[PDB]
Amino acid sequence: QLTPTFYDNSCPNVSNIVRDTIVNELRSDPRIAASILRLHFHDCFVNGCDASILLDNTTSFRTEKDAFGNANSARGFPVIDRMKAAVESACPRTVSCADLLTIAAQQSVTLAGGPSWRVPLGRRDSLQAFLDLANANLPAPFFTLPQLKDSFRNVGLNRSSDLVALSGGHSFGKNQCRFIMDRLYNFSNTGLPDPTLNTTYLQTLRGLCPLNGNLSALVDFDLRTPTIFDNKYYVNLEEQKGLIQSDQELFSSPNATDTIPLVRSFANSTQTFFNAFVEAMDRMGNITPLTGTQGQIRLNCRVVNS
């Protein structure tokens, strides 16, 4: 069983080292906190939270970094190496990359103004990466609500509260024009913009993402508080101002009978959202972990030991 006190004896300062590393990085890159949370998410949705996503290419297996969901998207890997090196110096061969990334995600959320809690620990590192599993498991921004739900259930999260609460991760962070071009100019081959996108916001987004423009240009997930982790992400949905398709569907989809009340619940109370996010976060963090003697304590998160 995973436990929050796993390193209280072997490395009582792991959480502190991780925090300081993020605090320093945030001064030169205010997007790092969001990037790190996403890395933990993409790690857990592929064979569980086993740091498989941090592994680089080998002649035997391809890195998950080249998955459609990570390629020219996932970021912050060097920052993870920095906190890892620091932790290894403070406590040699003690903290796994999988646990490190979990703590890093929790600290990122807290540093961004989100809830604060102690994540369960005791996960160990994988001996391989799963590129194909990543392309199949990572949900896409153009997914319908049914697909989004299927995606979460596929990894072990059956609750709609998991999807709605974890989707709150979009209360900060950036998104490329590339993933909303369809919503702005030609949604589902209708030749028209997505009707579930507020017309006034549509205009704003079209200005940031003109047709035939830079598809790599970055746009904020939350027009209200772009870098602050809060429940404003849900208020946007209620106003049809969710950035990507997968966001707005939680409130506009014909299959959203169960997600709508959850969206409103989180939008009405920060405490309600924070509690659900913590609960959902720990559930995601409990997806098929390697524990005990399974897997290893990777010294360099990029490669398997020795």
Q: Any idea which residues carry the catalytic annotation?
A: 42
Residue 101, CB-side half-sphere exposure with 13 Å CA sphere: 37
Q: Does 144 bind ligand FER (CB under 6 A)?
A: no
Of all helices (H) and strands (E), which one includes residue 54? none
Q: Does 73 bind ligand FER (CB under 6 A)?
A: yes
Question: At its nearest, how many Å lie between ligand HEM and the CB of residue 81?
Answer: 17
CA–CA gap between residue 274 and residue 262 (Å, rounded): 13
In terms of C-beta density within 10 A (0-12 exposed, 13-18 middle, 19 or more buried), how is residue 144 classed? middle
Question: At its nearest, how many Å lie between Ca ion and the CB of residue 225?
Answer: 3
Minimum CB distance to ligand HEM smaller for 173 or for 295: 173
CA–CA gap between residue 223 and residue 207 (Å, rounded): 14
Q: Does 81 bind ligand FER (CB under 6 A)?
A: no
- Backbone dihedral region for residue 122 (phi beyond 0: left; psi -120 to 50: alpha; all else: beta): left
CA–CA gap between residue 176 and residue 183 (Å, rounded): 13
Q: Looking only at residues 180 through 199 of this chain, which bind Ca ion when binding is defined by CB under 5 A?
A: none
Binding site partner of 227, from ligand HEM, ligand FER, Ca ion, none, Cβ cut-off 5-8 A by kind: none
Q: Looking only at residues 229 through 288 of this chain, which bind ligand FER when binding is defined by CB under 6 A?
A: none
Q: Which residues in 146-266 belong to E strands, given as ranges?
A: 174-176, 218-220
* Binding test (CB under 5 A) with Ca ion, winner from 225, 265, 269, 270: 225
Binding site partner of 17, from Ca ion, ligand FER, ligand HEM, none, Cβ cut-off 5-8 A by kind: ligand FER
Residues sharing a CB contact under 8 Å with residue 222, sequence separation 6 or more, in sequence order = 170, 171, 172, 228, 232, 233, 236, 243
Q: Does 69 bind ligand FER (CB under 6 A)?
A: yes
Binding site partner of 208, from ligand FER, ligand HEM, Ca ion, none, Cβ cut-off 5-8 A by kind: none
* Binding test (CB under 5 A) with Ca ion, winner from 136, 211, 215, 228: 228
Q: Does 20 bind ligand FER (CB under 6 A)?
A: yes
What's the Cα-to-Cα distance from 69 to each of 42, 65, 72, 74, 269, rounded to whole Å? 8, 8, 9, 8, 31
Q: Which two three-digit tokens encode residue 125?
A: 């590192």
Q: Does 94 bind ligand FER (CB under 6 A)?
A: no
Minimum CB distance to ligand HEM smaller for 13 or for 265: 265
Footprint on this chain of Ca ion (rule: CB under 5 A): 43, 46-47, 50, 52, 171, 222, 225, 228, 230, 232
